[model samples]
Target: AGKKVLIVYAHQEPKSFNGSLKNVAVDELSRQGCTVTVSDLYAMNFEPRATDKDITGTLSNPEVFNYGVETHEAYKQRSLASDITDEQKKVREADLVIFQFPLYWFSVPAILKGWMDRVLCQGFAFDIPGFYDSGLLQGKLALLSVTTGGTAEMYTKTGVNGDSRYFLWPLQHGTLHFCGFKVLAPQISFAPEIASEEERKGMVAAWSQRLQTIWKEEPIPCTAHWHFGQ
Candidate 1:
């Protein structure tokens, strides 16, 4: 019996480059006897908004509609919608969680962003007194397997994007670390669409190869100095 891995995949087309990476991840990880689950955001038409519907039954406080507060309270009461609770169960049961998507505007796509906003709510992912180093999900591991339309040079420190790690601060430090996940080094598949057929195959093969030994990897020391040299 191997580990359980949950992949929160956010690609739309199965034939797309993003899809290839995700499918390979599942296949390779499964080949290792890891129980893998993929939450296909676009295919499921996953709701990307954090609204009142997320919490069923009477309002904990009907007068206010603060999403964070409401969702937090709903989590405490186990009153969140089944769709949300279902995902949470997968997250809770898994030892590793991977995010597969195309980076948009130097960040995640809108749907994935919404998944974070709604899925990683207060009291579940983090708490006021239990954040950062002491967050709720302390024992879990998280990784971002991303694809970009831009070439690697464009994301360098001297390039226009000012280091690919620069854009990752918000997602890595601000969110994932804040939730107490031991963040693994990101797998950035750059310019997949622009690559030659051979190059694309190389990228997919590389990703599959990595997953074969992912369990042997270590978490990066996520800090300000790592992304931005001071």
Candidate 2:
């Protein structure tokens, strides 16, 4: 009878660190009697490209191939590929959507990026006038559970990467916030690979412990000032 959750998980190996976090998430949520769905990107081999094939029947413009235009039309026409529509259905029914992934090049892996480009299309995730705080998915909650190769210190203001918030801006604000999901404070498990055995267990436990009360948490002040100071 608890809330529904959808975890768009992007990890290559089931025995990896990312996989541990994901399994813990599902287990914890399920233990709470919350219906959970995991779209394992790698296992599913989900499409990560935008092309005419995404549309089932007709091309809006046979003359030129425009991804956004075609997909938007496909979305409106209810003709998007089953793979895409399937993901959208999971997103639509869930109360909270958690993105689980290991950071790649300061962002999500290419496959996850492709999921964003294709699944969250116009008329579904956002519109010309219905974006940011007023986007279509306004009531839903979104969280990013990210892992990094670098240590926490390296992501600080003076460190080489220059503030972890700097890289989070695009995914949390630009994409998730723009889609109208109230952004929750991210669960950043830094340098899990290099940590000791006990440290790794601690990190995983910490994540599971937090999920126990995730619903009680409030959305972060997702603004320019929050990610970057004026």
**Tens digits of per-residue lDDT for model 1, 135-174:** 8999899999999989999999899878999999999999
List all candidate RMSDs to the true structure: 1.0, 0.8
Q: How does model 1 fare in lDDT?
A: 0.91
Q: Would you list the C-alpha lDDT of every candidate in the order shown? A: 0.91, 0.95
Q: What is the lDDT of residue 82 in candidate 2?
A: 94
**How do the residues 1-230 of candidate 2 rate in per-residue lDDT, one tens digit apiece?**
57999999999999999999999999999999999999999999988988788999799899998989999898999999999999999999999999999999999999999999999999999999999998999999999999999999999999999999999999999999999999999999999988999999999999999999999999999999999986
Q: Estimate each model's TM-score.
A: 0.97, 0.98
Candidate 1 runs further than 4 Å off: none
Runs in model 2 deviating more than 4 A are: none
Q: Best lDDT goes to which candidate?
A: 2
Cα-based RMSD of candidate 1: 1.0
